[PDB]
Amino acid sequence: SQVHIFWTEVILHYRPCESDPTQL
Amino acid sequence: QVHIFWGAPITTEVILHYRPCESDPTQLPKIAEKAIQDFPTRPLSRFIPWFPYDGSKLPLRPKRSPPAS
Amino acid sequence: RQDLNFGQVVADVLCEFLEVAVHLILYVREVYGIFQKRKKYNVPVQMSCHPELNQYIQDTLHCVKPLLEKNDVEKVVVVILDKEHRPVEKFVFEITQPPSHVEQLLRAFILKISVCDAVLDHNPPGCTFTVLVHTREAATRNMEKIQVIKDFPWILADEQDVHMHDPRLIPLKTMTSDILKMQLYVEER
Amino acid sequence: VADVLCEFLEVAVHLILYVREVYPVGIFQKRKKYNVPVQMSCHPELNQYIQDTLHCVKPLLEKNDVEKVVVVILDKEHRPVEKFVFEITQVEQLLRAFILKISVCDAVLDTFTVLVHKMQLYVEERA
Amino acid sequence: VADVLCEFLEVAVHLILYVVGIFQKRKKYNVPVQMSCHPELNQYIQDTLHCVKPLLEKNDVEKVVVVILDKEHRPVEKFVFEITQPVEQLLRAFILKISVCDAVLDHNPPGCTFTVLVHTMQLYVEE
Amino acid sequence: PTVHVEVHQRGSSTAKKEDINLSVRKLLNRHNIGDYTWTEFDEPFLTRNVQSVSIIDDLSACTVALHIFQLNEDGPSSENLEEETENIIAANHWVLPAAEFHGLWDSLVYDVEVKSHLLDYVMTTLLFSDKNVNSNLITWNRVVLLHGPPGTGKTSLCKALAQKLTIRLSSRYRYGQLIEINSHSLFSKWFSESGKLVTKMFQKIQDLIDDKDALVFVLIDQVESLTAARNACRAGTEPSDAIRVVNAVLTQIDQIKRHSNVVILTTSNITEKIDVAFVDRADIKQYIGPPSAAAIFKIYLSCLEELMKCQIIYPRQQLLTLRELEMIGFIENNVSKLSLLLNDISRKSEGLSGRVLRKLPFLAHALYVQAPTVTIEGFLQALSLAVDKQFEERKKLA
Amino acid sequence: PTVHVEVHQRGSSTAKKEDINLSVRKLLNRHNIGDYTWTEFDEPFLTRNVQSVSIIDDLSACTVALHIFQLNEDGPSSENLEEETENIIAANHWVLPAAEFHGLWDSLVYDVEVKSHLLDYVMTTLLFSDKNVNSNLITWNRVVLLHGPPGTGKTSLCKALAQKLTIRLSSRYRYGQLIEINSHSLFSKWFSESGKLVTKMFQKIQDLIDDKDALVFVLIDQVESLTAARNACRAGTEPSDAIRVVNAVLTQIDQIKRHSNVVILTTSNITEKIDVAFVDRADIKQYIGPPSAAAIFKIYLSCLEELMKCQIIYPRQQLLTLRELEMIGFIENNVSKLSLLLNDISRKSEGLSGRVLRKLPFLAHALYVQAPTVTIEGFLQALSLAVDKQFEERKKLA
Amino acid sequence: VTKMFQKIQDLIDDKDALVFVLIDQVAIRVVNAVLTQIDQIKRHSNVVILTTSNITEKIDVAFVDRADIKQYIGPPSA
């Protein structure tokens, strides 16, 4: 029911340190 | 932890919430990293009357009364 | 090339904006139940159904509307008051005037006075208003400019309807503007 | 109690939206629905929108990673022009007060995203 | 058991990053496995599983989908791990199932740049 | 030496830049064979993450540089007044690289080598910028003028420039802005209000300039309208428009000269009736002239193999370029006849503006041939009659 | 006679002033011997607290004058002049040398008569001021006007004068000042909102003159924006407010005539159709034409020297100057061959304005050279080609 | 022009409808927000735009320069 994107009501995940991928 | 719900249709990690059915934002994270950052913070300005109630400057008043009910 | 003059509405509209305001506030301040919910100025204004009270306002304000246009007026005050004619709710429109933005921010005004019933505690019903016209000249100087209306007469600053007190200002608004410093604030008692 | 403090935040968010005139559609009108003297929205889409945003921060707020509930009012560029920041350190007395607060806080002042980094509401506004 | 299952998901995700010289034999859970010495990756995968941890404290879960990406981040391969979540041979039996899977099948470019997902012991692969 | 390669990445493709670079370098080194463009690929990743690859001026050399770009989907943003938001400014705002601009740089055909001069101008600008030359000692006004006959694609070349520069110079500026200035909506004329209006749009230009990681191109159409010749005009009846609106732009542009990530591009029609104090503040004032015989032949080609590409002219006959006709030496032959007849149309269709040239196939397939599918030498005949149809129509309107 | 030395304090050279004075004194007593510029020293306090020591117009065991000066990195500091915060930026404010105008006085090249005159003017102003001459028997309005064909650099002359005089008079006055007036933010559409804004500007300037330790230069860039001709405004098109502005400006300029620390610098191009009642209110009206042959040679020599120093031209050659060329009697030889060929370029480049003469070293490397390096006689030929291109591009544009 | 063309665009993406759309006598007053929509629907294809302008040569840059073929009708016939 939920999916997470360690990169349906989706709980993504960001980890702001990695943020090179301009379009996440 | 910071919780950036882009939506409302017209160290510290980020638990952003995607929740898509459109797949066409093309910018959650930069706007998420925009909503996260503190920007020029205007100080809390204070309130004060500029015309106080002067005891030497007094008001006007008309005569008649309203229709009571 | 055409340089050109201007056509100010400056001092009059205020009171007649007060008209809307008072027609709203007489509603919201719970001092009107003969009021009806209506539509005007793109807001949920609550006005009065009585054309008789409409003409009563015509007399009370729309007769002095060019007479109130003297810029000497400091506090256009809706004193919301009991039988003693002393405030409980000082809607002090402190008109600090520096002589459609006016309704652009009276949008907030009307809208928030509408919300003021979520801030205004339960004021007892059965209490009327007086329009205290605070001028730059004390004790009602120049009776002519206040009794301009022939059928509608005016009175001097008699000891009862001249003073107010208990000034606890919670500035529900501080909406400065271009023409207006509408320092409206609801001074509770 | 957070199951009704979320609805108190509902009160807050829509009243900010309401007093800021973020839209000209005057949908808002007085709503004491279940005896709550607060002025919410008449869009059940948006009432349940706040409901499930707060639902999905319910495994997230009372976990107390919260360091400030920043209800940003967004911009045309989706910019935090007015971060209405609420500190998470928790009986109508506060409610009207917060209501009062918001109003008197909009006193000085003149598209919302609910970011979650005395309910000392303060406004970080553009100068 | 959820905690030790999360450590076995560690074993999985990273040994499957292996299943080149920047990797090394060391004792994990009383077996020698040839992974990476990277402390950043060690604690990063620990963080992935320990954010998966409250997720499994919810107990509502379907899969731990350890997506082995291509370099394009647009899956030409994948590894869905549909454990229907409610001795050493069997703690190594899972690893031999995945080894025989990558045996009949094939891996991806050296840096698999994988992004673990979860859908909230058995498995397969969508190639 | 050096050669340039540009590759269209798809918007729905999101692979990292360096993977794209490695894959295209792999394709090039495997193939390593003139200026033709790749469209066919043999790698599922590269297919779903690339649209085309192209060489811009048959050699196995490896002096290759890759420019990768994304033509932005949405069109123009609009610019209106700050407090008079109704119509005061209304400037156009392209966020380059933009979709509606591609293929534009290729289609245009000239014969004075405007493209190379006007591109290596900006290249040398960047060279002098990175080397830290004394801006007090060697300077440029960053203003390029283009004037010439009406309808001859003068303004087309500026959008092509901007597109080609935000493509070529990627990874040196994340993106480019292109502000199209309407020089007719800034003449609210009652006692120098337009001369005060230029100031607001130029402050907005300053706003878009200080974002020092974005290359900005300011495109002014009808630069004769904003800067009317004040001196020679013996009209004192012009109160403050001819003196306080030209002087209100000769300053705001001398103010952006100090910055370096800005370029001013201007399109003019009348060579005279423009302020002599603005024909000194332009680095390149290049004249775009009406197409010449070889140019006309090349444009007609472009049109005809365009029609063949879409199967309009179903029986595909090889259209021989003028170089092959020179090589054979104008020898009549069963395939060489069609190129010859095209070339006779080229001399007969001489002196027309490029816009009517790029129209003429439309009319020649409109009136003279209704066929949904056409054989060559009748369509060519349709052109040879439609050109005379255009001459007579122009003579009709006196 | 006196020779003048300027010594430049670096950013953190805070130490003192008198120590530097005496230190440069013993430096000059150890040297004692055209204009020169020292940048490399030996004594540690010199090498640390001094960036440059220039002797600007031999036996120096005579009268010598020092001017210690330190550049200030401040910025615009705009004056809002807002009545209700709706007004727009006016009167941008420059300060004691802002490092943006540094090196200006010597890059500009005119005839000899244009700088010495404009300097001893302000010098005699103070000479008369502090000898207590009678105010109303010999007086001046303290206003200078510069006119010439456009492009010949008459805003740089005023800003460089401000720089040079702030430095040259650092003893009589604590520091300098400059207000550049935005002559297009004073006007307003409404009735008698113009003259009030003009008098508001000049009363603000008057406030800035209240202190007698500053030295205020007021630069009105293009007067005809403000002092429009009064009678030439023909029937009906130009309202009355075009007269109130001019006479308010004239009255204010007369009202700030009494002080002694204000100089008003005003310029306008060949559009010298200035109101006569203002074109009489001017002590010095100087003509700034286009550069002459020697001026062209010096601009080109400076451009080439800077380019060699900056490593766009790698192989450095010692280019002669006119004085030695007339010394050798124009004898052709290897050392002067390139010098004479540059001179022949100059003799054929007569006619353009300075505004473009400092572009050509950028165009001749932007349009006729590909390698980011080139030898002299390989770059100087592209200079001739760019000169001819500019001339033709002028000619065919009518 | 906002919802009318969303309906029309629902009628365009299908290959079956030859939708032609008439504009009559060619936010509010700080643009008409009609351009951006009509310009974007120009792109869909199989949606052909006709405009009964009824206004002579005097024309704005907004629509009269994106229009390609322009014919004039004078007085009606007998």
Ligand SMILES: Nc1ncnc2c1ncn2[C@@H]1O[C@H](COP(=O)(O)OP(=O)(O)OP(O)(O)=S)[C@@H](O)[C@H]1O
């Ligand atoms: N010389 C040319 N070669 C090839 N195509 C041309 C040429 N000139 C014009 N075109 C085509 O003309 C169309 C538009 O040209 P425009 O640039 O609008 O002409 P223009 O010069 O703008 O005229 P003005 O000045 O705006 S009237 C483009 O689609 C060009 O492809």
Ligand SMILES: Nc1ncnc2c1ncn2[C@@H]1O[C@H](COP(=O)(O)OP(=O)(O)OP(O)(O)=S)[C@@H](O)[C@H]1O
């Ligand atoms: N005689 C000169 N020597 C060197 N440079 C000059 C000379 N004349 C002009 N220039 C160059 O001109 C460049 C710009 O001069 P500007 O002052 O902007 O011209 P200017 O006269 O403002 O033009 P207006 O304002 O249109 S008269 C300066 O950088 C000067 O170098």
